[PDB]
Amino acid sequence: MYVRTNLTILSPGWLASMTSADGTHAYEMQKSPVLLVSWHGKVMQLKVEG
Amino acid sequence: MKFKKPPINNPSDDATIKLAEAAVSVSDSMLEMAKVEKVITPPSKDNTLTIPNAYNLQARASVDWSGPIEELTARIAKAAHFRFRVLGKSPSVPVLISISTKDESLAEILRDIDYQAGKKASIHVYPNSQVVELRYAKIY
């Protein structure tokens, strides 16, 4: 999965991490349905299915 | 008729005086943080059930060691006449424990070793099978 976000990924690991000046971040991620995002200090979990 | 006061010693060193007065404050801070940590954290169980005591285990030892774990625990396995078992890969970061003790039996020696190792490894002993196993952390 190739994800464009304004947020960042914390837990599972990363392979390619592109980041622009305006805060747009591109993350290359392996096939994982569960992710954890650290929004401004507090971490919440997201689950994505097909 | 001459007067005196009891505790007279050899002459001292000012650098050791400074080290002592620093370490007094260091030890006091360590004591109070240990107190508040013990108060805050509720204990659950003791490792003596996992590490019991039996015969041919009360032969005593006096040990100073400040190196890697494996040579020391193989030495105490040879003392115990017990088999050795290793579980898990040895991590690239070495695990080091310094021990300065006097007249301690093998069971509490192993308990102190396991406590000082902490999260990095665990120790078990099966006396019926006459084995001692160590297991690295299933981490990273």
């Binding site: - | 005593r60 030892a61 006096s62 040990v63 020391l72």
Partner: protein
């Protein structure tokens, strides 16, 4: 190279073999095989009869033993104690363990540069003779010191 050490500090092999010869002349059993060394001491020359108490003159022999033991480089030293059958198994084992503990405490109190000392006793478990008629003066009553010389 003069700033580098030439030998180990406080070492003279002639003095080592001299005091070894003096100990074996006195009656202290000295045993060498490879770099593994053992010394046997009669327990009657150290303790009283079936009791863990030391003579005041025993400190001379202990000092001599520590002086000899300072001459080597070591890792692990083991002491075992053996006695004669008097009352039970438990009493003799406890006596031998106590004697080993006291002599190991004194040997650590002296500044010998070892890492690990193991201490144990067996009572009258392992005889070294078929002759078992003497009391504590019999040669089975003994204390054995064993190690392997490093390098």
């Amino acid at each position: 190279v003069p700033k580098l050490p030439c030998r180990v500090d406080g070492a003279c092999d002639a003095t080592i073999i001299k005091m070894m010869t003096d100990l074996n002349k006195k009656g202290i059993k000295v045993a060498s095989v490879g770099q593994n060394y053992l010394i046997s001491i009669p327990a009657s020359a150290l303790f009283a009869d079936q009791s863990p108490r030391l003579n005041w003159a025993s400190y001379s022999l202990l000092n001599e033993i520590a002086a000899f033991l300072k001459q080597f480089r070591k890792i692990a030293i083991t002491v075992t104690s053996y006695s004669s059958k008097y009352v039970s198994v438990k009493r003799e084992r406890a006596l031998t363990l106590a004697r080993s503990r006291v002599v190991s405490e004194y040997l650590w109190s002296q500044g010998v540069d070892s890492r690990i000392i193991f201490t144990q006793g067996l009572g009258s478990d392992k005889p070294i003779t078929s002759y078992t008629l003497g009391g504590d003066r019999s040669p089975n009553a003994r204390v054995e010191i064993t190690f392997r010389r490093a390098v």
